[PDB]
Enzyme design. Structure first.
Site, PDB file in Angstrom:
ATOM      1  N   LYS A  35      78.871  92.375 119.760  1.00  0.00           N
ATOM      2  CA  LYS A  35      80.213  92.422 119.168  1.00  0.00           C
ATOM      3  C   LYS A  35      80.251  92.555 117.636  1.00  0.00           C
ATOM      4  CE  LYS A  35      80.783  87.405 119.072  1.00  0.00           C
ATOM      5  NZ  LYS A  35      81.198  86.240 119.892  1.00  0.00           N
ATOM      6  N   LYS A  49      72.921  75.560 121.268  1.00  0.00           N
ATOM      7  CA  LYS A  49      73.260  75.222 119.884  1.00  0.00           C
ATOM      8  C   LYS A  49      74.708  74.812 119.659  1.00  0.00           C
ATOM      9  CE  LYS A  49      73.509  78.719 116.830  1.00  0.00           C
ATOM     10  NZ  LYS A  49      74.964  78.654 116.531  1.00  0.00           N
ATOM     11  N   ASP A  69      77.992  75.473 117.714  1.00  0.00           N
ATOM     12  CA  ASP A  69      78.581  76.619 117.061  1.00  0.00           C
ATOM     13  C   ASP A  69      78.548  76.350 115.558  1.00  0.00           C
ATOM     14  OD1 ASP A  69      79.827  79.163 117.101  1.00  0.00           O
ATOM     15  OD2 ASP A  69      81.086  78.600 118.775  1.00  0.00           O
ATOM     16  N   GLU A  70      78.458  77.410 114.761  1.00  0.00           N
ATOM     17  CA  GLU A  70      78.335  77.276 113.315  1.00  0.00           C
ATOM     18  C   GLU A  70      79.386  76.360 112.671  1.00  0.00           C
ATOM     19  OE1 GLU A  70      79.268  80.477 114.655  1.00  0.00           O
ATOM     20  OE2 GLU A  70      81.321  79.846 114.191  1.00  0.00           O
ATOM     21  N   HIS A 126      71.862  79.651 110.498  1.00  0.00           N
ATOM     22  CA  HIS A 126      73.014  80.485 110.821  1.00  0.00           C
ATOM     23  C   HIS A 126      73.479  81.179 109.549  1.00  0.00           C
ATOM     24  CE1 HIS A 126      76.981  81.734 112.194  1.00  0.00           C
ATOM     25  NE2 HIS A 126      76.563  81.497 113.424  1.00  0.00           N
ATOM     26  N   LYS A 131      80.581  76.840 124.143  1.00  0.00           N
ATOM     27  CA  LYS A 131      81.963  77.272 123.922  1.00  0.00           C
ATOM     28  C   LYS A 131      82.876  76.415 124.784  1.00  0.00           C
ATOM     29  CE  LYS A 131      80.454  80.858 121.534  1.00  0.00           C
ATOM     30  NZ  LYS A 131      80.466  80.956 120.043  1.00  0.00           N
TER      31      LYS A 131
HETATM   32  O1  LIG Z   1      80.293  82.147 117.184  1.00  0.00           O
HETATM   33  C1  LIG Z   1      79.743  83.134 117.749  1.00  0.00           C
HETATM   34  O2  LIG Z   1      80.428  84.173 117.987  1.00  0.00           O
HETATM   35  C2  LIG Z   1      78.257  83.030 118.142  1.00  0.00           C
HETATM   36  O3  LIG Z   1      78.013  81.643 118.491  1.00  0.00           O
HETATM   37  C3  LIG Z   1      77.911  83.891 119.362  1.00  0.00           C
HETATM   38  O4  LIG Z   1      78.708  83.562 120.485  1.00  0.00           O
HETATM   39  P1  LIG Z   1      78.620  84.440 121.834  1.00  0.00           P
HETATM   40  O5  LIG Z   1      77.201  84.430 122.327  1.00  0.00           O
HETATM   41  O6  LIG Z   1      79.499  83.826 122.891  1.00  0.00           O
HETATM   42  O7  LIG Z   1      79.067  85.851 121.546  1.00  0.00           O
HETATM   43  C4  LIG Z   1      77.336  83.345 116.955  1.00  0.00           C
HETATM   44  O8  LIG Z   1      77.533  82.362 115.956  1.00  0.00           O
HETATM   45  C5  LIG Z   1      77.483  84.758 116.382  1.00  0.00           C
HETATM   46  O9  LIG Z   1      76.568  85.599 117.054  1.00  0.00           O
HETATM   47  C6  LIG Z   1      77.193  84.822 114.886  1.00  0.00           C
HETATM   48  O10 LIG Z   1      77.075  86.170 114.484  1.00  0.00           O
HETATM   49  P2  LIG Z   1      75.719  86.738 113.840  1.00  0.00           P
HETATM   50  O11 LIG Z   1      74.530  86.470 114.729  1.00  0.00           O
HETATM   51  O12 LIG Z   1      75.868  88.231 113.705  1.00  0.00           O
HETATM   52  O13 LIG Z   1      75.512  86.092 112.489  1.00  0.00           O
HETATM   53 MG   LIG Z   2      78.806  80.619 116.583  1.00  0.00          MG
END
Ligand SMILES: O=C(O)[C@@](O)(COP(=O)(O)O)[C@H](O)[C@H](O)COP(=O)(O)O
Ligand SMILES: [Mg+2]
Ligand SMILES: O=C(O)[C@@](O)(COP(=O)(O)O)[C@H](O)[C@H](O)COP(=O)(O)O
Ligand SMILES: O=C(O)[C@@](O)(COP(=O)(O)O)[C@H](O)[C@H](O)COP(=O)(O)O
Ligand SMILES: [Mg+2]
Ligand SMILES: [Mg+2]
Ligand SMILES: [Mg+2]
Lengths: 465, 140, 465, 228, 356, 140
Positions: free
Chosen positions: C324, C191, C193-194, C284, C165
């Site tokens: 969250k 990783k 981020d998506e 993801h 982040k």
């Molecule tokens: O972008 C985000 O918020 C995350 O990188 C988590 O960040 P944090 O660890 O800082 O919260 C993940 O992609 C989410 O968990 C996706 O949701 P899910 O797993 O439910 O598909």
């Molecule tokens: Mg993410």
């Protein structure tokens, strides 16, 4: 400001009601239903944060970059009339956030995670403002309405198509048989059903070959250009391409893709292939209603339609309004304009939340298909105008005299209505008379009008404005 | 603020971030193997063969993905199939460490239904090892 | 029995309550909300017809084939307790209907059109029975749980990951800097981020190279195998592959793909590539909640999870239950089993409508990610067991002392809970004590516990059983 | 149940007369002639073992996996009427044992080694049950009967073919000559003899070309689709 | 030669006993990728038979455990280990996972022992494209040797693979899976010597020859005959060994015979006596069945082989003094002693079906 | 059960798994060379060039298959063509080991009909070598 660890409200960084949007910003309109005791401001801020640069606790790495430059911004929150707990939250995303030419990446940021947040009960993306500066990064549709009409040598009326039925279970030879009989009666196109790919009862290459024979026979017989949307939808990009390659090598005009079930990544690849090889690309919107049916949650079809236009397609299904599948009139007229036109003004009564400037990217041909027949013809010509394709699967293959007379009936109805409109007749009110006059004149049409006379699709509309 | 040292702070996978395991703590891990019906086994390696490395990749084309030397260690005797006695495992640890006092030695267990090692931790490092920190000196 | 033109009820052909399902049939469980005055039988029959062989009016081409052999069948209709107008309709599809190896085709039939029908108000695909005979046509996940653990040489505990982040805005050098510092503290993985793909602030190849440096430095430092999910998600298959190719040539262990925003066709391609070149593939689920959040309409995640398993992925995000993002405990435990296990029995109290036999197809590693921190550790280890990956983005980069101490904190907490469970302690009840004992012992953990002590995510669950 | 080195009877692990076959199992029927003083049960068990998971002495690696899951199973032994020393031994193979889409692999397991065992005098594979779940892993025939008829546009009668003779020795031009004269008379097909490949008296590409000429000449003459 | 004639109504049975392949035809074949001389030279191995080992159980092991078993066998003194003939690519173990872990095992064993090591990685597959992909991966891992089941894969695929091996420097081990379907009965089929000649022409560095003494059938005199046909440049007509024709191989490389199938330490003297040094001796169960694991199992076989080799070089007659040589080596090597104790009473003596 | 040691247990191909050859046993192998008409030859290498290695492959594309450095050793004088005296070979072993007392030395023999080395075994290792085990310490 130094680094301070710990959780704080999203609104402190991501709610900016005094922000002046930039002409290069991507804008998003979210229909937002927050949980009880979550302020709209904080909810809209969460959406903005978690679809751009932020997470659930403060991170030190922010200081290494410029959050001001990259952050998504909730810049306006609108109450929804008639609703106690529903809001339109407007989010602005800087152009730097997006990969050039990638609908996949836009979707990944804007709709990636925010819909699953515990802090909200429901979320729906209503509209996106795609700026010209971003639009220009996309190859876009392989040809578009103008070029398609020019290549097919077809002008002055809607195009007519037809989905071969039964959906599945027909052999490749019978498929071509059905295609030949439909095309020779006056339809411009026929098509693979969306789920016709390659199967034990009919392998794709067999179908392509027989269909080619059927296209060329019908063309030679009628003296009009003919096509059949051969489905390139497949399990892998390699299979999709092999199917595209075969069509190219057969010299046929048009293929098809199910862009949501296949995916944007595959779709863009195919669109670029179709550009480089001169194939028209018909897009089927299979799966869309899983996403776009409900008013409270999902993504409205107008966004899915904008996305397709950027990704690439010469045709996209638009709904019928009057047929077996849902589509409210005013909303449909709205996204049809968004598919076809260069410039569309903000118009809330049609669901258009943002002025959309397409900066010369070709228009996509709307395709009206699903539970329509000859009596719907006036209403169809009235809604869509000439720049559309009208498709009659059951309405052709369900004719009592077979495919050819079925096609002739649809062709006659279309042309009668087109003539009537050109003559100054009002299709909204004189529609039935035009069809009746054509009935008393055309026996193929009469047989069709007799069979489907009492058939209507009138149910309460779920997706309202 | 304390700083995690990059110097001579090599780890050893599972449990190496905890304080070194006491004999009582090793014994409880062995009970866990037995209670779950897993197959106990001991592995060992000299110092040069203890950590993952790349030397073989010199012989490769573009195929080094997920290839590392020193993942395999040397098996001590055979996996103790059908063993239901924790004392038997503990005696083999003593026997293994006696025969190879200068080797890295780890205790592992196998599940035969999933066919995978289901647990593992280091039980001995050579007393000449200088590449690791005690728990309280891992940050400075 | 001849050809009779015109419209008739779907139920005459497509509602077969006495049908005995075959072991090779695909079975679907739809949550169905019909319009007023549409009988459940006719509604279920319509859903069966329009997702298999039928259309809105009788077609003559039926006679050329055997409808008996190919038609989808609504064979059972179940009232939903507590609901006046909601039913579970069970549909059986003969194996001949589907293209071997193609999740795209399966989705195109089963969820393609029926969700948009005027005759229903809402529709939700709850479950699918993928028979062994169909499962065997899929290459499936490149490696799966067992092989992954074997290649990484990691056993006896959950894996630890971390999303860098801020989501967007970091330069390639800083990305690698954040990656090195996180991996060297005890995390197995970091990783992209998506939505990190390739953008003006950071081009992908620059990132891949700096990340490779970070991976190899952390690995040398710790003597543990390290990886970073490099995002191959792109606008076109060609771009996607180029990125996978580069990873291969850097010798790094793992890449990632957003399978819903990229699409099933692209994803299968990538899985097959990963199989042929020995790359781990982290999946993801970006966009899933657009589809799977609401109880009345969409496709439940367990189906999206089954679809991914068939298409291919070594990891798939499963939700956290406690973080969250939404995910109800019992439902989650149900689809985690479907992701991991070889054989899962019908269990309506976990949302499992059908017994699922995976016929030896590798299990997919669940990934718990989103709003979790050290105090969640006991609950996480208790829900998932060892065969999972636990990801702390904010829970790492939000640590007051930086990434390395952040990672050490998470690693200590994970190992403390794992040791405690192994000793016979109950993590559901002694969880807080285990963490507190570890706190008094590890200062890095203490600092994390202090900062996030009061932080919880407790909201009313939307997607209920 | 530990590791115990040494030889033991195959039947202890591989003869399972109470086994209920699965719908995904591959089933084999072997015509079995055991040596004198080798029980049919032990002979069938040996065939089952050495075509699936087992060898001649106990191996410790068995314990790392699950023999119950992977082992071939002799589940039934049938006497042959009119024969003193012949049996039909039924073997079940779990679907996990086979590579998807590979007839080579299936043959390698089922008929790989067992036919050469000293403990039997003769062995014959009489039938195989290929379960649907395995059949689906094969691409299978390029077109098959229906598609072929459809492409050739031929219905309502058997097809007629003909092998060019003499088997070997003919030149490409004469091959094409004989092909034309045979097709134009009413035969749908002609064919290369099985041993006609490419040889000093006739190279393949020469043949293909002249044959093409023959096919197209016959087709134009008769108005029927022709092939070779 | 064998296309149609066996199905004729006019005959009750037909068996092809021998073929005379003339030098003018032999020269049209690329032949084996390397052959006995070149193989020894690349492996740097001289003065004794080569030792191999098939991993067991046949099927059911994961890739990691496969490599585990490979490492422990190779480090004990075996030169080679191998995929079982039916180990290709399956749900329980995919081929590429196996190739990688096996490579790790080969290189670990080699560094540990200081001797060149290899493992016959099975390239046998459903399609030529799959076969080639497997061969390509082996090439790219730098490993010495792969394998092919030439009868179940087929001659066309085999010749392709042999040419690939030639062009890229891979040794090619041939498994003869299915041969006994064809060659077991005296009245009907094709005798192995013909299948062996075919293989030499098609291409193979190794070919299984039988053991004579193990679990699978092979008559002594007939085996000595086709071993000569596989190895030598020139073999005279000799009816007492089943050689119907004088065979001139016109300098085509010899194929290394592989004796495998139900053999153990007590068979070592007879094996060295039948084959001499130019052979590979394989102990699957004879290694993985040792009471102390793979490494001691390998050491036992290595000690037995070397003891017999030394004895033969010293002028001892292995036909008569075989038992003594093994016993002397037992009293000296505890690994060997353990092996001798377990398999002491184990013999394979049945009536020979395929007679002269 | 006894465990085969992975530590400092390097071998030397043919005969290295037997007890070290006595002068009488070396002499019998030499007789076997002479009796069969084979060409005796001596080869030698310093410690660093003794065992198979990979260093040259750094210069390669994907062509390392069956390439190893250190297969070739250095020839002592020439192969003893036409040698019909076992004592002649034995004296050459003495001369070679005298000139290179710190080298690995091996006796080999060639067959000229097959054109291949037909036998070979180590006759000297440096007394400083610490990477090998005596027969009775090979397992523990
Ligand atoms: O972008 C985000 O918020 C995350 O990188 C988590 O960040 P944090 O660890 O800082 O919260 C993940 O992609 C989410 O968990 C996706 O949701 P899910 O797993 O439910 O598909
Ligand atoms: Mg993410
Ligand atoms: O499968 C079908 O039902 C159709 O072929 C229509 O068949 P009929 O002409 O026989 O009704 C179309 O795919 C639908 O129009 C898709 O819906 P939409 O265009 O709204 O996406
Ligand atoms: O599958 C087997 O049985 C083997 O691996 C031997 O195993 P063991 O060493 O454990 O007996 C060999 O493939 C056979 O020798 C083949 O027969 P042949 O050599 O006659 O063709
Ligand atoms: Mg359709
Ligand atoms: Mg013939
Ligand atoms: Mg074998």
């Amino acid at each position: 400001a130094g680094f301070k660890a710990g959780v704080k409200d999203y609104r402190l960084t991501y709610y900016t009601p005094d922000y002046v949007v930039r002409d290069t910003d991507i804008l998003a309109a979210f229909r937002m239903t927050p949980q009880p005791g979550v302020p709209p401001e904080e909810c809209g801020a969460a959406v903005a944060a978690e679809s751009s640069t932020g997470t659930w606790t403060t991170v030190w790495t922010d200081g290494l970059t410029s959050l001001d430059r990259y952050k998504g911004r909730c810049y306006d929150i609108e109450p929804v009339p008639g609703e106690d707990n529903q809001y339109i939250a407007y989010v602005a995303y800087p152009i730097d956030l997006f990969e050039e030419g990638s609908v996949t990446n836009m979707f990944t940021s804007i709709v990636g995670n925010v819909f699953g947040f515990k802090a909200l009960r429901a979320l729906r993306l209503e509209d996106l403002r795609i700026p010209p500066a971003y639009v220009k990064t996309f190859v876009g549709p392989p040809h578009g309405i103008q070029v398609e009409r020019d290549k097919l040598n077809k002008y002055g009326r809607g195009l007519l198509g037809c989905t071969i039925k039964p959906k599945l279970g027909l052999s490749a030879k019978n498929y071509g048989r059905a295609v030949y009989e439909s095309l020779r009666g006056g339809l411009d196109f026929t098509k693979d059903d969306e789920n016709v790919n390659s199967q034990p009862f009919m392998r794709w290459r067999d179908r392509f070959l027989f269909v080619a024979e059927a296209i060329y026979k019908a063309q030679a017989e009628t003296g009009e250009v003919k096509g059949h949307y051969l489905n390139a939808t497949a399990g892998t990009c390699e299979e999709m391409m092999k199917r595209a390659v075969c069509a190219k090598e057969l010299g046929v005009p048009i293929i098809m893709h199910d862009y949501l079930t296949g995916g944007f990544t595959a779709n863009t690849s195919l669109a670029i292939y179709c550009r480089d090889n001169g194939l028209l690309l018909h897009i089927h919107r299979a799966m869309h209603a899983v996403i776009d049916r409900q008013r409270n949650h999902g993504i409205h079809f107008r966004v899915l339609a904008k996305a397709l236009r950027m990704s690439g397609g010469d045709h996209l299904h638009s709904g019928t309004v009057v047929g077996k599948l849902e589509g409210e009139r005013e909303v449909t007229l709205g996204f049809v304009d968004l598919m076809r036109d260069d410039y569309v003004e903000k118009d809330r009564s049609r669901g258009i939340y943002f002025t959309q400037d397409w900066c010369s990217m070709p228009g996509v041909m709307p395709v009206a298909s699903g539970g329509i027949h000859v009596w719907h013809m006036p209403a169809l010509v009235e809604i869509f105008g000439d720049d559309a394709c009208l498709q009659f699967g059951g309405g052709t293959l369900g004719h009592p005299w077979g495919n050819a007379p079925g096609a002739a009936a649809n062709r006659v109805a279309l042309e009668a209505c087109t003539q009537a409109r050109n003559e100054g007749r009002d299709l909204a009110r004189e529609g039935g008379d035009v069809i009746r006059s054509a009935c008393k004149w055309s026996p193929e049409l009469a047989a069709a009008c007799e069979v489907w006379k009492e058939i209507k699709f009138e149910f309460d509309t779920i997706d309202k404005l | 603020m304390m700083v995690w040292t990059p110097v001579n702070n090599k780890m050893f996978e599972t449990f190496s971030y905890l304080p070194p395991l006491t004999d009582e703590q090793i014994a409880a891990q062995v009970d866990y193997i037995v209670a779950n019906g897993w197959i106990p086994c001991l592995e060992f390696a000299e110092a040069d063969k203890a950590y993952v490395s790349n030397e073989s990749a010199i012989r490769f084309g573009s195929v080094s993905c997920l290839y590392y030397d020193n993942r395999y260690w040397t098996m001590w005797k055979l996996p103790m199939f059908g063993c239901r006695d924790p004392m038997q495992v503990l005696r083999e640890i003593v026997a293994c460490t006696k025969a190879f006092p200068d080797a890295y030695v780890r205790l592992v267990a196998f599940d035969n239904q999933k066919q995978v090692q289901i647990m593992g931790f280091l039980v001995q490092r050579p007393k000449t090892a200088r590449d690791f920190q005690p728990a309280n000196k891992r940050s400075v």
